[PDB]
Coordinates of all heavy atoms in Angstrom, one line a residue:
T34 N -19.1 -18.3 1.0 CA -18.7 -18.6 -0.4 C -17.2 -18.8 -0.6 O -16.7 -19.7 -1.3 CB -19.3 -17.6 -1.4 OG1 -18.9 -17.8 -2.8 CG2 -19.0 -16.1 -1.0
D35 N -16.5 -17.8 0.1 CA -15.0 -17.8 0.1 C -14.4 -17.7 -1.3 O -13.2 -18.0 -1.5 CB -14.5 -19.0 0.9 CG -15.0 -19.1 2.4 OD1 -16.2 -19.2 2.6 OD2 -14.1 -19.1 3.3
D36 N -15.2 -17.2 -2.2 CA -14.9 -17.2 -3.7 C -14.4 -15.7 -4.1 O -14.4 -14.9 -3.2 CB -16.2 -17.6 -4.5 CG -15.9 -18.0 -5.9 OD1 -15.5 -19.1 -6.1 OD2 -16.1 -17.2 -6.8
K37 N -14.1 -15.6 -5.4 CA -13.6 -14.3 -5.9 C -14.7 -13.6 -6.8 O -15.1 -12.5 -6.5 CB -12.3 -14.5 -6.7 CG -12.3 -15.6 -7.8 CD -12.3 -17.1 -7.2 CE -11.1 -17.4 -6.3 NZ -9.8 -17.1 -7.0
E38 N -15.2 -14.3 -7.8 CA -16.2 -13.8 -8.7 C -17.6 -13.7 -8.1 O -18.3 -12.7 -8.3 CB -16.3 -14.6 -10.0 CG -16.6 -16.1 -9.9 CD -16.9 -16.8 -11.2 OE1 -15.9 -17.1 -11.9 OE2 -18.0 -17.1 -11.6
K39 N -18.0 -14.8 -7.3 CA -19.3 -14.9 -6.7 C -19.6 -13.7 -5.8 O -20.7 -13.1 -5.8 CB -19.6 -16.3 -6.0 CG -21.0 -16.4 -5.3 CD -21.3 -17.8 -4.9 CE -22.7 -17.8 -4.2 NZ -23.8 -17.3 -5.2
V40 N -18.7 -13.4 -4.9 CA -18.8 -12.3 -3.9 C -19.2 -11.0 -4.7 O -20.1 -10.3 -4.2 CB -17.5 -12.0 -3.1 CG1 -17.6 -10.8 -2.1 CG2 -17.1 -13.3 -2.3
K41 N -18.5 -10.7 -5.8 CA -18.7 -9.6 -6.7 C -20.2 -9.6 -7.2 O -20.8 -8.5 -7.3 CB -17.7 -9.6 -7.9 CG -16.2 -9.6 -7.4 CD -15.3 -9.7 -8.6 CE -13.8 -9.8 -8.2 NZ -12.9 -10.0 -9.4
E42 N -20.7 -10.8 -7.6 CA -22.0 -11.0 -8.2 C -23.1 -10.7 -7.1 O -24.1 -10.1 -7.4 CB -22.2 -12.4 -8.7 CG -21.2 -12.8 -9.8 CD -21.3 -12.0 -11.1 OE1 -22.3 -12.0 -11.7 OE2 -20.3 -11.3 -11.4
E43 N -22.8 -11.1 -5.8 CA -23.7 -10.9 -4.7 C -23.7 -9.4 -4.2 O -24.7 -8.9 -3.7 CB -23.2 -11.8 -3.4 CG -23.0 -13.3 -3.7 CD -24.1 -14.0 -4.5 OE1 -25.2 -14.3 -4.0 OE2 -23.9 -14.2 -5.8
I44 N -22.5 -8.7 -4.5 CA -22.4 -7.2 -4.2 C -23.3 -6.4 -5.1 O -23.9 -5.4 -4.7 CB -20.9 -6.8 -4.3 CG1 -20.0 -7.3 -3.2 CG2 -20.7 -5.2 -4.4 CD1 -18.5 -7.0 -3.3
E45 N -23.5 -6.9 -6.4 CA -24.4 -6.3 -7.4 C -25.9 -6.4 -6.8 O -26.6 -5.5 -6.9 CB -24.2 -7.0 -8.8 CG -24.7 -6.2 -10.0 CD -26.2 -5.9 -10.1 OE1 -26.9 -6.8 -10.6 OE2 -26.7 -4.8 -9.8
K46 N -26.2 -7.6 -6.3 CA -27.5 -7.9 -5.7 C -27.7 -7.0 -4.4 O -28.9 -6.6 -4.2 CB -27.6 -9.4 -5.3 CG -27.3 -10.4 -6.4 CD -27.3 -11.9 -5.9 CE -26.9 -12.9 -7.0 NZ -26.8 -14.3 -6.5
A47 N -26.7 -6.8 -3.6 CA -26.7 -6.1 -2.4 C -27.0 -4.6 -2.6 O -27.9 -4.0 -1.9 CB -25.4 -6.2 -1.6
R48 N -26.3 -4.0 -3.5 CA -26.5 -2.6 -3.9 C -27.9 -2.4 -4.6 O -28.5 -1.3 -4.5 CB -25.4 -2.1 -4.8 CG -25.5 -2.6 -6.3 CD -24.4 -2.1 -7.3 NE -24.8 -2.2 -8.7 CZ -24.0 -2.3 -9.7 NH1 -22.7 -2.5 -9.6 NH2 -24.6 -2.3 -10.9
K49 N -28.4 -3.4 -5.2 CA -29.6 -3.5 -6.0 C -30.8 -3.4 -5.1 O -31.7 -2.5 -5.3 CB -29.6 -4.8 -6.9 CG -30.4 -4.7 -8.2 CD -30.1 -6.0 -9.1 CE -30.5 -5.8 -10.5 NZ -30.0 -6.9 -11.4
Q50 N -30.8 -4.2 -4.0 CA -31.8 -4.2 -3.0 C -31.6 -3.0 -2.1 O -32.6 -2.5 -1.5 CB -31.7 -5.5 -2.1 CG -31.9 -6.8 -2.9 CD -33.3 -7.0 -3.4 OE1 -33.7 -6.6 -4.5 NE2 -34.2 -7.5 -2.6
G51 N -30.4 -2.5 -2.0 CA -30.1 -1.4 -1.1 C -29.9 -1.8 0.4 O -30.1 -1.1 1.3
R52 N -29.4 -3.1 0.5 CA -29.3 -3.7 1.9 C -27.8 -4.0 2.1 O -27.1 -4.3 1.1 CB -30.1 -5.1 1.9 CG -31.6 -4.9 1.7 CD -32.4 -6.2 1.6 NE -33.8 -6.0 1.3 CZ -34.6 -6.9 0.7 NH1 -34.1 -8.1 0.4 NH2 -35.9 -6.6 0.4
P53 N -27.3 -4.0 3.4 CA -25.9 -4.4 3.7 C -25.7 -6.0 3.5 O -26.7 -6.7 3.5 CB -25.8 -4.1 5.2 CG -27.2 -4.0 5.8 CD -28.1 -3.6 4.6
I54 N -24.5 -6.3 3.1 CA -24.1 -7.7 2.7 C -22.9 -8.1 3.6 O -22.0 -7.4 3.8 CB -23.8 -7.8 1.2 CG1 -23.5 -9.3 0.8 CG2 -22.7 -6.8 0.8 CD1 -23.3 -9.5 -0.7
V55 N -23.0 -9.4 4.2 CA -22.0 -9.9 5.1 C -21.4 -11.1 4.4 O -22.0 -12.2 4.3 CB -22.6 -10.3 6.5 CG1 -21.5 -10.5 7.5 CG2 -23.6 -9.1 7.0
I56 N -20.1 -11.0 4.0 CA -19.4 -12.0 3.3 C -18.4 -12.8 4.2 O -17.5 -12.1 4.7 CB -18.6 -11.4 2.0 CG1 -19.7 -10.8 1.0 CG2 -17.8 -12.5 1.3 CD1 -20.6 -11.8 0.3
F57 N -18.7 -14.1 4.5 CA -17.9 -14.9 5.4 C -16.8 -15.6 4.6 O -17.0 -16.6 3.9 CB -18.8 -15.9 6.2 CG -19.7 -15.3 7.1 CD1 -20.9 -14.6 6.7 CD2 -19.5 -15.3 8.5 CE1 -21.8 -14.0 7.6 CE2 -20.3 -14.7 9.4 CZ -21.5 -14.1 9.0
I58 N -15.5 -15.1 4.8 CA -14.3 -15.7 4.2 C -13.4 -16.3 5.3 O -13.4 -15.7 6.5 CB -13.5 -14.6 3.5 CG1 -14.4 -13.7 2.5 CG2 -12.3 -15.2 2.7 CD1 -14.8 -14.4 1.2
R59 N -12.7 -17.3 5.0 CA -11.8 -18.0 6.0 C -10.4 -17.3 6.0 O -10.1 -16.6 5.0 CB -11.7 -19.5 5.7 CG -11.1 -20.4 6.8 CD -11.0 -21.9 6.3 NE -10.4 -22.8 7.3 CZ -10.4 -24.1 7.3 NH1 -11.1 -24.8 6.3 NH2 -9.8 -24.8 8.2
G60 N -9.5 -17.6 7.0 CA -8.2 -17.0 7.1 C -7.3 -17.3 5.9 O -6.6 -16.5 5.4
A61 N -7.3 -18.6 5.4 CA -6.5 -19.1 4.3 C -7.1 -18.5 3.0 O -6.4 -18.1 2.0 CB -6.5 -20.6 4.2
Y62 N -8.4 -18.5 2.9 CA -9.2 -17.9 1.8 C -9.1 -16.4 1.7 O -9.4 -15.8 0.6 CB -10.7 -18.4 1.8 CG -10.9 -19.8 1.4 CD1 -11.0 -20.9 2.3 CD2 -11.1 -20.1 0.0 CE1 -11.2 -22.2 1.9 CE2 -11.3 -21.4 -0.4 CZ -11.4 -22.4 0.6 OH -11.6 -23.7 0.2
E63 N -8.8 -15.7 2.8 CA -8.7 -14.2 2.9 C -7.8 -13.6 1.8 O -8.1 -12.5 1.3 CB -8.3 -13.8 4.3 CG -8.5 -12.2 4.5 CD -7.8 -11.7 5.8 OE1 -6.6 -12.0 6.1 OE2 -8.5 -11.0 6.6
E64 N -6.8 -14.4 1.4 CA -5.9 -14.0 0.3 C -6.7 -13.6 -1.0 O -6.3 -12.7 -1.7 CB -4.9 -15.2 0.1 CG -3.8 -15.0 -1.0 CD -2.8 -13.9 -0.6 OE1 -1.8 -14.3 0.2 OE2 -2.9 -12.7 -1.0
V65 N -7.8 -14.3 -1.2 CA -8.7 -14.1 -2.4 C -9.4 -12.7 -2.3 O -9.6 -12.1 -3.4 CB -9.8 -15.2 -2.5 CG1 -10.8 -15.0 -3.6 CG2 -9.1 -16.6 -2.7
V66 N -9.7 -12.2 -1.1 CA -10.4 -11.0 -0.8 C -9.9 -9.7 -1.6 O -10.6 -8.9 -2.0 CB -10.6 -10.7 0.7 CG1 -11.4 -9.4 1.0 CG2 -11.3 -11.9 1.4
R67 N -8.5 -9.7 -1.7 CA -7.9 -8.5 -2.4 C -8.3 -8.4 -3.9 O -8.4 -7.2 -4.4 CB -6.3 -8.6 -2.3 CG -5.5 -7.4 -2.7 CD -4.1 -7.4 -2.2 NE -3.3 -8.6 -2.6 CZ -2.6 -9.5 -1.9 NH1 -2.6 -9.4 -0.6 NH2 -2.0 -10.5 -2.4
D68 N -8.5 -9.5 -4.5 CA -9.0 -9.6 -5.9 C -10.5 -8.9 -6.0 O -10.8 -8.2 -7.0 CB -9.1 -11.1 -6.4 CG -9.6 -11.2 -7.8 OD1 -8.9 -11.0 -8.8 OD2 -10.8 -11.6 -8.0
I69 N -11.2 -9.2 -4.9 CA -12.6 -8.7 -4.8 C -12.6 -7.1 -4.4 O -13.5 -6.4 -4.9 CB -13.4 -9.5 -3.7 CG1 -13.2 -11.0 -3.8 CG2 -14.9 -9.1 -3.6 CD1 -13.6 -11.8 -2.6
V70 N -11.6 -6.7 -3.6 CA -11.5 -5.3 -3.2 C -11.6 -4.3 -4.3 O -12.3 -3.3 -4.2 CB -10.2 -5.1 -2.3 CG1 -9.8 -3.6 -2.1 CG2 -10.3 -5.8 -1.0
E71 N -10.9 -4.6 -5.4 CA -10.8 -3.7 -6.6 C -12.2 -3.4 -7.1 O -12.6 -2.3 -7.3 CB -10.0 -4.4 -7.8 CG -9.8 -3.5 -9.0 CD -9.1 -4.2 -10.2 OE1 -7.9 -4.3 -10.2 OE2 -9.9 -4.6 -11.1
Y72 N -13.0 -4.5 -7.3 CA -14.4 -4.4 -7.8 C -15.3 -3.5 -6.8 O -16.0 -2.6 -7.3 CB -15.1 -5.8 -7.9 CG -16.6 -5.8 -8.2 CD1 -17.0 -5.7 -9.5 CD2 -17.5 -6.0 -7.2 CE1 -18.4 -5.7 -9.8 CE2 -18.9 -5.9 -7.5 CZ -19.3 -5.8 -8.8 OH -20.6 -5.8 -9.1
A73 N -15.2 -3.8 -5.5 CA -15.9 -3.1 -4.5 C -15.6 -1.6 -4.4 O -16.4 -0.8 -4.1 CB -15.7 -3.8 -3.1
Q74 N -14.4 -1.3 -4.8 CA -13.9 0.1 -5.0 C -14.6 0.8 -6.2 O -15.0 1.9 -6.2 CB -12.4 0.2 -5.1 CG -11.6 -0.3 -3.9 CD -10.1 -0.2 -4.0 OE1 -9.6 -0.3 -5.1 NE2 -9.4 0.0 -2.9
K75 N -14.6 0.0 -7.3 CA -15.2 0.4 -8.6 C -16.7 0.6 -8.5 O -17.3 1.4 -9.3 CB -14.8 -0.6 -9.7 CG -13.3 -0.8 -10.0 CD -12.6 0.4 -10.6 CE -13.2 0.9 -11.9 NZ -12.5 2.1 -12.5
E76 N -17.3 -0.1 -7.6 CA -18.7 0.2 -7.1 C -18.8 1.6 -6.5 O -19.7 2.3 -6.9 CB -19.1 -0.9 -6.1 CG -19.1 -2.4 -6.5 CD -20.2 -2.7 -7.6 OE1 -19.9 -2.5 -8.8 OE2 -21.2 -3.2 -7.2
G77 N -17.9 1.9 -5.6 CA -18.0 3.1 -4.8 C -18.7 2.9 -3.5 O -19.4 3.7 -3.0
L78 N -18.6 1.6 -3.0 CA -19.3 1.2 -1.7 C -18.3 1.3 -0.5 O -17.1 1.4 -0.7 CB -19.8 -0.3 -1.9 CG -20.8 -0.5 -3.0 CD1 -21.2 -2.0 -3.0 CD2 -22.1 0.3 -2.7
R79 N -19.0 1.4 0.7 CA -18.2 1.3 1.9 C -17.8 -0.1 2.2 O -18.6 -1.0 2.4 CB -19.2 1.8 3.1 CG -18.6 1.8 4.5 CD -17.3 2.7 4.7 NE -16.9 2.8 6.1 CZ -15.6 2.9 6.5 NH1 -14.6 2.9 5.6 NH2 -15.3 3.0 7.8
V80 N -16.5 -0.3 2.2 CA -15.9 -1.7 2.3 C -15.2 -1.7 3.7 O -14.3 -1.0 4.0 CB -14.8 -2.0 1.2 CG1 -14.3 -3.5 1.3 CG2 -15.3 -1.6 -0.2
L81 N -15.7 -2.7 4.5 CA -15.4 -2.8 5.9 C -15.1 -4.3 6.3 O -16.0 -5.0 6.3 CB -16.5 -2.2 6.8 CG -16.3 -2.1 8.3 CD1 -15.3 -1.0 8.6 CD2 -17.6 -1.8 9.1
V82 N -13.9 -4.6 6.5 CA -13.5 -6.0 6.8 C -13.5 -6.2 8.3 O -12.6 -5.6 9.0 CB -12.1 -6.4 6.1 CG1 -11.8 -7.9 6.4 CG2 -12.2 -6.1 4.6
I83 N -14.4 -7.1 8.8 CA -14.5 -7.4 10.2 C -13.7 -8.7 10.4 O -14.1 -9.8 10.0 CB -16.0 -7.6 10.7 CG1 -16.7 -6.3 10.3 CG2 -16.1 -7.9 12.2 CD1 -18.2 -6.4 10.4
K84 N -12.5 -8.6 11.1 CA -11.5 -9.6 11.0 C -11.1 -10.0 12.5 O -10.8 -9.1 13.3 CB -10.3 -9.0 10.2 CG -9.0 -9.8 10.1 CD -7.9 -9.0 9.5 CE -6.6 -9.8 9.5 NZ -6.6 -11.1 8.7
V85 N -11.0 -11.3 12.8 CA -10.6 -11.8 14.0 C -9.1 -11.9 14.0 O -8.6 -12.9 13.4 CB -11.3 -13.1 14.4 CG1 -10.8 -13.7 15.7 CG2 -12.8 -13.0 14.4
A86 N -8.4 -11.0 14.6 CA -6.9 -11.1 14.8 C -6.6 -12.0 16.0 O -7.4 -12.1 16.9 CB -6.3 -9.7 15.0
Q87 N -5.4 -12.7 15.9 CA -5.0 -13.7 16.9 C -3.5 -14.0 16.8 O -3.1 -15.2 17.0 CB -5.9 -15.0 16.9 CG -6.1 -15.6 15.5 CD -7.2 -16.7 15.4 OE1 -7.1 -17.6 14.6 NE2 -8.3 -16.6 16.2
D88 N -2.7 -13.0 16.6 CA -1.2 -13.1 16.5 C -0.7 -14.1 15.5 O -0.4 -15.2 15.9 CB -0.6 -13.3 17.9 CG 0.9 -13.3 18.0 OD1 1.6 -12.3 17.9 OD2 1.5 -14.4 18.1
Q89 N -0.8 -13.8 14.2 CA -0.4 -14.7 13.1 C 0.2 -13.9 12.0 O -0.3 -12.9 11.6 CB -1.5 -15.6 12.6 CG -2.0 -16.7 13.5 CD -3.2 -17.5 13.0 OE1 -2.9 -18.6 12.3 NE2 -4.4 -17.1 13.2
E90 N 1.4 -14.4 11.5 CA 2.2 -13.7 10.4 C 1.4 -13.7 9.1 O 1.5 -12.7 8.3 CB 3.6 -14.4 10.3 CG 3.5 -15.9 10.0 CD 4.8 -16.6 10.0 OE1 5.5 -16.5 9.0 OE2 5.2 -17.3 11.0
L91 N 0.7 -14.8 8.8 CA -0.1 -14.9 7.5 C -1.3 -13.9 7.6 O -1.6 -13.2 6.6 CB -0.6 -16.4 7.4 CG -1.1 -16.9 6.0 CD1 -1.1 -18.4 5.9 CD2 -2.5 -16.3 5.6
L92 N -2.0 -13.9 8.7 CA -3.1 -13.1 9.0 C -2.7 -11.6 9.0 O -3.5 -10.8 8.5 CB -3.7 -13.5 10.5 CG -4.9 -12.7 11.1 CD1 -5.6 -13.6 12.1 CD2 -4.4 -11.4 11.8
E93 N -1.5 -11.3 9.4 CA -1.0 -9.9 9.4 C -0.6 -9.5 8.0 O -0.8 -8.3 7.6 CB 0.2 -9.8 10.4 CG 0.7 -8.4 10.8 CD 1.4 -7.6 9.7 OE1 2.6 -8.0 9.3 OE2 0.9 -6.6 9.2
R94 N 0.0 -10.5 7.3 CA 0.6 -10.2 5.9 C -0.4 -9.6 5.0 O -0.2 -8.5 4.4 CB 1.1 -11.6 5.3 CG 1.8 -11.4 3.9 CD 2.1 -12.8 3.3 NE 0.8 -13.4 2.9 CZ 0.5 -14.7 3.1 NH1 1.3 -15.6 3.7 NH2 -0.7 -15.2 2.7
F95 N -1.6 -10.2 4.9 CA -2.7 -9.8 4.1 C -3.4 -8.5 4.6 O -3.7 -7.6 3.9 CB -3.8 -10.9 4.0 CG -4.9 -10.5 2.9 CD1 -4.6 -10.7 1.6 CD2 -6.1 -10.0 3.3 CE1 -5.6 -10.4 0.7 CE2 -7.0 -9.6 2.4 CZ -6.8 -9.8 1.1
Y96 N -3.5 -8.4 6.0 CA -4.1 -7.3 6.7 C -3.5 -5.9 6.4 O -4.2 -4.9 6.4 CB -3.9 -7.7 8.2 CG -4.1 -6.5 9.3 CD1 -5.3 -6.0 9.6 CD2 -3.0 -6.0 9.9 CE1 -5.4 -5.0 10.5 CE2 -3.1 -5.0 10.9 CZ -4.3 -4.5 11.2 OH -4.4 -3.5 12.1
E97 N -2.2 -6.0 6.1 CA -1.4 -4.7 5.9 C -1.8 -4.1 4.5 O -1.9 -2.9 4.4 CB 0.1 -5.1 5.9 CG 1.1 -4.0 5.4 CD 1.1 -2.7 6.3 OE1 1.7 -2.7 7.4 OE2 0.5 -1.7 5.9
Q98 N -2.2 -5.0 3.6 CA -2.7 -4.5 2.2 C -3.9 -3.6 2.4 O -4.1 -2.6 1.6 CB -3.0 -5.7 1.3 CG -1.7 -6.3 0.7 CD -0.9 -7.2 1.6 OE1 -1.0 -8.4 1.6 NE2 0.0 -6.6 2.4
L99 N -4.8 -3.9 3.3 CA -6.1 -3.2 3.5 C -5.9 -1.8 4.0 O -6.5 -0.8 3.4 CB -7.0 -4.0 4.6 CG -7.7 -5.3 4.1 CD1 -6.6 -6.4 3.6 CD2 -8.5 -5.9 5.2
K100 N -5.0 -1.6 5.0 CA -4.8 -0.3 5.6 C -3.9 0.6 4.7 O -4.1 1.8 4.6 CB -4.1 -0.5 7.0 CG -5.0 -1.4 7.9 CD -4.4 -1.5 9.4 CE -4.3 -0.2 10.1 NZ -3.0 0.5 9.8
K101 N -2.9 0.0 4.1 CA -2.0 0.7 3.1 C -2.7 1.2 1.9 O -2.4 2.3 1.4 CB -0.8 -0.3 2.7 CG 0.3 0.4 1.9 CD 1.5 -0.6 1.5 CE 2.1 -1.3 2.7 NZ 2.5 -0.4 3.8
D102 N -3.7 0.5 1.5 CA -4.6 0.9 0.4 C -5.6 2.0 0.8 O -5.5 3.1 0.3 CB -5.5 -0.4 -0.1 CG -6.6 -0.1 -1.1 OD1 -6.3 0.0 -2.3 OD2 -7.7 0.2 -0.7
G103 N -6.4 1.7 1.8 CA -7.4 2.7 2.3 C -8.7 2.0 2.7 O -9.6 2.7 3.3
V104 N -8.9 0.7 2.4 CA -10.0 -0.1 2.9 C -10.0 -0.2 4.4 O -8.9 -0.6 5.0 CB -10.1 -1.5 2.2 CG1 -11.1 -2.5 2.8 CG2 -10.4 -1.3 0.7
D105 N -11.1 0.0 5.1 CA -11.2 0.0 6.5 C -11.3 -1.5 7.0 O -12.0 -2.3 6.4 CB -12.5 0.8 7.0 CG -12.4 1.4 8.4 OD1 -12.2 0.6 9.3 OD2 -12.5 2.6 8.5
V106 N -10.7 -1.8 8.1 CA -10.7 -3.1 8.7 C -10.8 -3.0 10.2 O -10.0 -2.4 10.9 CB -9.3 -3.9 8.3 CG1 -8.1 -3.1 8.5 CG2 -9.3 -5.3 9.0

Side-chain angles (χ1 to χ4, degrees):
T34 174
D35 301 62
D36 197 82
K37 49 289 300 307
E38 60 172 74
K39 178 169 180 57
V40 179
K41 303 175 184 178
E42 302 299 296
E43 311 311 282
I44 290 176
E45 204 292 279
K46 305 175 185 180
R48 76 178 201 207
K49 209 166 193 170
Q50 297 296 90
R52 299 175 185 157
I54 183 176
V55 193
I56 299 293
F57 291 76
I58 311 289
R59 193 184 178 166
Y62 283 95
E63 192 189 51
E64 184 67 84
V65 176
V66 179
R67 191 166 57 231
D68 181 75
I69 313 169
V70 165
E71 185 189 279
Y72 174 83
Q74 298 181 330
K75 297 296 298 179
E76 299 290 85
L78 296 176
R79 178 60 173 148
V80 188
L81 187 69
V82 180
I83 306 171
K84 176 187 174 63
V85 178
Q87 49 187 212
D88 181 77
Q89 290 180 90
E90 56 184 284
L91 197 163
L92 177 154
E93 194 288 292
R94 185 191 64 224
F95 188 80
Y96 163 72
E97 172 61 78
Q98 281 76 94
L99 286 57
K100 300 184 63 279
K101 188 179 303 306
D102 172 86
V104 167
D105 207 299
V106 50

